[PDB]
Amino acid sequence: MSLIDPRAIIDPSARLAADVQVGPWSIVGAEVEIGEGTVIGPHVVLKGPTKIGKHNRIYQFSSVGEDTPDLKYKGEPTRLVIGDHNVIREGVTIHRGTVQDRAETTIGDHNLIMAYAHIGHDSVIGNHCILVNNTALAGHVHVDDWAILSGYTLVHQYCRIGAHSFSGMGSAIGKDVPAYVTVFGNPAEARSMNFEGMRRRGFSSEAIHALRRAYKVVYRQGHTVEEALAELAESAAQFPEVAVFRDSIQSATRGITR
Amino acid sequence: MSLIDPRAIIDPSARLAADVQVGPWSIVGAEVEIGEGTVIGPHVVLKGPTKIGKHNRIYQFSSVGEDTPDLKYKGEPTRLVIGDHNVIREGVTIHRGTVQDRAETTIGDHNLIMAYAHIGHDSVIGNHCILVNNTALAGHVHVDDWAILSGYTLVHQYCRIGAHSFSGMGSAIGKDVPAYVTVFGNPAEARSMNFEGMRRRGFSSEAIHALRRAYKVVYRQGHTVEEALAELAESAAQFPEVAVFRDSIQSATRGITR
Amino acid sequence: MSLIDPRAIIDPSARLAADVQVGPWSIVGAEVEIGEGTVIGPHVVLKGPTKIGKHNRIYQFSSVGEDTPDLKYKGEPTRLVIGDHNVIREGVTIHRGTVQDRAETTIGDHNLIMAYAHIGHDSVIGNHCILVNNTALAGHVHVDDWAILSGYTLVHQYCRIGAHSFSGMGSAIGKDVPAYVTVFGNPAEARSMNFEGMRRRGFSSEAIHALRRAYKVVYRQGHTVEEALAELAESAAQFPEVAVFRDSIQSATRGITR
Numbered sequence: 020m021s022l023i024d025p026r027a028i029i030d031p032s033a034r035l036a037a038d039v040q041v042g043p044w045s046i047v048g049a050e051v052e053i054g055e056g057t058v059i060g061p062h063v064v065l066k067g068p069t070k071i072g073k074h075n076r077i078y079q080f081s082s083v084g085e086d087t088p089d090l091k092y093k094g095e096p097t098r099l100v101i102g103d104h105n106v107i108r109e110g111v112t113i114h115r116g117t118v119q120d121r122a123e124t125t126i127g128d129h130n131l132i133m134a135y136a137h138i139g140h141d142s143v144i145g146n147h148c149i150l151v152n153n154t155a156l157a158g159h160v161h162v163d164d165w166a167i168l169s170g171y172t173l174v175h176q177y178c179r180i181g182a183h184s185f186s187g188m189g190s191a192i193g194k195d196v197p198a199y200v201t202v203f204g205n206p207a208e209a210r211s212m213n214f215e216g217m218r219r220r221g222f223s224s225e226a227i228h229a230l231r232r233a234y235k236v237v238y239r240q241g242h243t244v245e246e247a248l249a250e251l252a253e254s255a256a257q258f259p260e261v262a263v264f265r266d267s268i269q270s271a272t273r274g275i276t277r
Numbered sequence: 278m279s280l281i282d283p284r285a286i287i288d289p290s291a292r293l294a295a296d297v298q299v300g301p302w303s304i305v306g307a308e309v310e311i312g313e314g315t316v317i318g319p320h321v322v323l324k325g326p327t328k329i330g331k332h333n334r335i336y337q338f339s340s341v342g343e344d345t346p347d348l349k350y351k352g353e354p355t356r357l358v359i360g361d362h363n364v365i366r367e368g369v370t371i372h373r374g375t376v377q378d379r380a381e382t383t384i385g386d387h388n389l390i391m392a393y394a395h396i397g398h399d400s401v402i403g404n405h406c407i408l409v410n411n412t413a414l415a416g417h418v419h420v421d422d423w424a425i426l427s428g429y430t431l432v433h434q435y436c437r438i439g440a441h442s443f444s445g446m447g448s449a450i451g452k453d454v455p456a457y458v459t460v461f462g463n464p465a466e467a468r469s470m471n472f473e474g475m476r477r478r479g480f481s482s483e484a485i486h487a488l489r490r491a492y493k494v495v496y497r498q499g500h501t502v503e504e505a506l507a508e509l510a511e512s513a514a515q516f517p518e519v520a521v522f523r524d525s526i527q528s529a530t531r532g533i534t535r
Numbered sequence: 536m537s538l539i540d541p542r543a544i545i546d547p548s549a550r551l552a553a554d555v556q557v558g559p560w561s562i563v564g565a566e567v568e569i570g571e572g573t574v575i576g577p578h579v580v581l582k583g584p585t586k587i588g589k590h591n592r593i594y595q596f597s598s599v600g601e602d603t604p605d606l607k608y609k610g611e612p613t614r615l616v617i618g619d620h621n622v623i624r625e626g627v628t629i630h631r632g633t634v635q636d637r638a639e640t641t642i643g644d645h646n647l648i649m650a651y652a653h654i655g656h657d658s659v660i661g662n663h664c665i666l667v668n669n670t671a672l673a674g675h676v677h678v679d680d681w682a683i684l685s686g687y688t689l690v691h692q693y694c695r696i697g698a699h700s701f702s703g704m705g706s707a708i709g710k711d712v713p714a715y716v717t718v719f720g721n722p723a724e725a726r727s728m729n730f731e732g733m734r735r736r737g738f739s740s741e742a743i744h745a746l747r748r749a750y751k752v753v754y755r756q757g758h759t760v761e762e763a764l765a766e767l768a769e770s771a772a773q774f775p776e777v778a779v780f781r782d783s784i785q786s787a788t789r790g791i792t793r
């Protein structure tokens with residue numbers, strides 16, 4: 020019936036909204052901030068500088084705000100930001116940024132990060148993502164809204180996981196995953212679009228069909244990527260949903276003068 | 278040398294047989310019941326309604342009987358049941374069931390579940406299994422007696438792992454695995470039968486042979502599953518061991534009226 | 536600020552050099568030696584007999600020194616040895632040896648072992664190695680100096696990972712990785728040599744070229760291993776760096792009288 024367990028350790032410099040809860044044997048280190056309504060389980064380690072928003076649930080054996088062990092990082096003061104309404108399940112690791120990117124690891128709102136997931140330095144997670152058990156973002160990975168990374172999905176540094184994209188269990192992602200796309204295997208290859216994601220968002224059935232077509236343009240017609248982007252111009256102007264897709268491919272590929 | 282560490286937390290409503298041990302900083306939650314001579318390590322978390330049987334050994338950092346995070350599950354009073362003589366190693370996660378199935382995750386007797394493995398909601402495990410480090414049953418997975426899942430084996434929802442079957446390390450299993458079959462890879466593919474295990478269980482020469490022939494019927498003679506089953510009916514009447522194999526195949530493949 | 540937290544448990548048979556630190560809720564079991572300047576985080580479990588050198592850092596939720604659960608192990612008094620200047624990150628498991636090999640798991644100096652990495656019974660790791668998150672040495676694995684195992688690399692028992700070798704993420708290694716070689720995928724396959732490694736170690740550019748040719752000899756040229764071994768003798772006499780590669784291939788393939 021008492022919010023901060025007396026067997027937890029709270030740095031004087033940490034700053035908790037009053038109705039925060041911290042379970043027994045949890046450490047809330049210096050420079051950690053925790054928002055209205057957040058619940059910290061038993062045996063959690065928070066290190067900062069780290070800003071956690073409201074209504075987060077962080078489960079046992081999680082390390083949130085540790086330094087990345089990557090030799091690149093040499094002790095510079097770098098940040099972790101986690102938004103509102105996230106659930107961080109048991110044993111998750113989330114590391115702070117590195118000064119060679121934007122010095123921040125960033126998690127939005129309403130995400131579900133399942134047991135043993137790992138969220139490496141400088142990674143950016145948007146909103147409503149699901150990282151299933153043991154998903155690992157190596158570093159500087161961007162995961163846009165509604166993405167679902169199935170169990171034990173691995174993501175190479177710098178890859179972008181597009182909105183509503185979906186990886187199958189054990190996927191090893193080496194390159195960007197365009198919005199809506201489903202990918203499978205080691206290495207990750209594209210199979211289809213996430214029609215289920217599209218239903219659950221109540222996408223019009225013209226938009227669902229347009230996105231099937233945009234898939235075929237990119238993947239099943241021998242277009243080069245530059246050829247696909249050009250063909251997609253029309254659909255992208257017709258349908259905001261296709262434009263999200265065109266844009267995710269556009270961002271992955273600048274190229275070099277040939 | 279006093280069985281329940283005073284540094285542990287034991288809910289009033291927990292039920293511990295007389296000679297149970299509980300290490301320090303371990304939580305035995307409400308509606309958790311533990312049988313004779315079971316040993317709980319330190320830093321274990323137990324949540325209920327959970328019933329754990331006799332002579333089990335649960336290692337540090339395990340979270341046994343927690344709710345699945347799956348959005349489908351809505352806080353209902355589902356259960357976990359663990360039998361006798363199991364060994365659950367460091368960091369294992371085991372979740373209670375969901376009302377959509379039978380409201381019960383179930384583990385039998387004499388199993389070895391190694392570090393960081395995950396036993397998803399509604400999974401049923403038989404007896405004498407080995408889940409090696411980081412094996413992950415996504416949900417509603419049935420693992421029949423003596424099955425060995427090598428390290429980092431992933432099993433998709435609703436899959437049945439047959440008696441005596443074997444998965445190689447990093448297998449990504451997405452369809453049922455019949456009794457005795459060895460599977461490998463991502464996605465998992467059948468390679469042989471688990472003769473090592475047949476030897477250990479003291480199978481006759483004749484039975485080991487019958488099982489090799491039965492493998493050849495299903496996997497190496499162009500037969501459909503329907504034709505393979507027909508061909509096995511004889512071998513299955515002659516050898517209990519083959520019948521286990523015939524039945525594992527039967528109950529994967531109900532089919533649709535063509 | 537007391538170097539040993541009063542909330543930690545220290546066996547009287549443990550021997551700590553004077554400026555050892557142990558965080559809260561850590562256990563240092565019987566027969567654990569910890570060298571000068573080492574730091575044990577909170578929530579660590581150390582079991583013995585184990586010998587840990589100078590200036591190591593072991594992080595929260597790590598279990599270092601436990602028994603392997605492999606059923607061949609029968610409680611014999613096997614050992615774990617860890618040199619100096621290693622970093623063992625959140626949740627690593629390291630198991631002691633088995634009497635059927637040398638009764639010792641062994642780790643050298645300046646290694647980096649990242650979250651949830653698993654160092655199985657009897658493994659031998661040299662110096663300046665990096666095992667990224669979730670790397671798993673199943674048992675009796677030899678890793679030689681400067682090797683890099685990317686995230687979720689799995690290594691089959693008895694495999695030798697060669698000096699400066701490199702595995703890509705999700706690699707499933709069933710066989711020896713010769714020095715400098717890069718391998719990828721499940722099953723793991725050779726692709727190139729770890730030129731980046733050779734750079735960072737100041738190799739002559741003649742030696743880098745000699746190691747590229749040596750690769751071509753072994754992998755890209757029809758040769759049997761015995762044929763490649765014989766072609767490499769000249770190159771191995773000219774360049775110590777090549778000799779290390781010849782020797783990794785030598786000491787992998789004894790063969791049988793045919």
Ligand SMILES: N#Cc1ccc(CN(Cc2c[nH]cn2)C(=O)CSc2ccccc2Cl)cc1
Pocket residue numbers: 149151152167168169170171187188346347348349395397413414415416431432433434
């Ligand atoms: N709330 C939710 C939610 C949403 C999507 C998923 C995705 N999901 C189911 C799926 C894959 N393809 C079709 N359905 C998996 O990740 C299974 S793998 C796994 C699962 C759990 C633990 C360990 C492992 Cl390994 C899972 C959960």
Ligand SMILES: N#Cc1ccc(CN(Cc2c[nH]cn2)C(=O)CSc2ccccc2Cl)cc1
Pocket residue numbers: 407409410425426427428429445446604605606607653655671672673674689690691692
């Ligand atoms: N008691 C036992 C017992 C039985 C079977 C196995 C199966 N096993 C060994 C094997 C594969 N093929 C032939 N023998 C593995 O899982 C190796 S992988 C691994 C192993 C350990 C940790 C991490 C990892 Cl990744 C392992 C142990």
Ligand SMILES: N#Cc1ccc(CN(Cc2c[nH]cn2)C(=O)CSc2ccccc2Cl)cc1
Pocket residue numbers: 088089090091137139155156157158173174175176665667668683684685686687704
């Ligand atoms: N110090 C270092 C160091 C050296 C090599 C590697 C190897 N490396 C790539 C890399 C090169 N530089 C930065 N990162 C990976 O393992 C990526 S996978 C991964 C990574 C991290 C968590 C989970 C996963 Cl899955 C990684 C780090």
Ligand SMILES: [Cl-]
Pocket residue numbers: none
């Ligand atoms: Cl059409």
Ligand SMILES: [Cl-]
Pocket residue numbers: 235239
């Ligand atoms: Cl098509």
Ligand SMILES: [Cl-]
Pocket residue numbers: none
């Ligand atoms: Cl059933």
Ligand SMILES: [Cl-]
Pocket residue numbers: none
């Ligand atoms: Cl025959």
Ligand SMILES: [Cl-]
Pocket residue numbers: 493497
């Ligand atoms: Cl054949």
Ligand SMILES: [Cl-]
Pocket residue numbers: 748
């Ligand atoms: Cl040349």
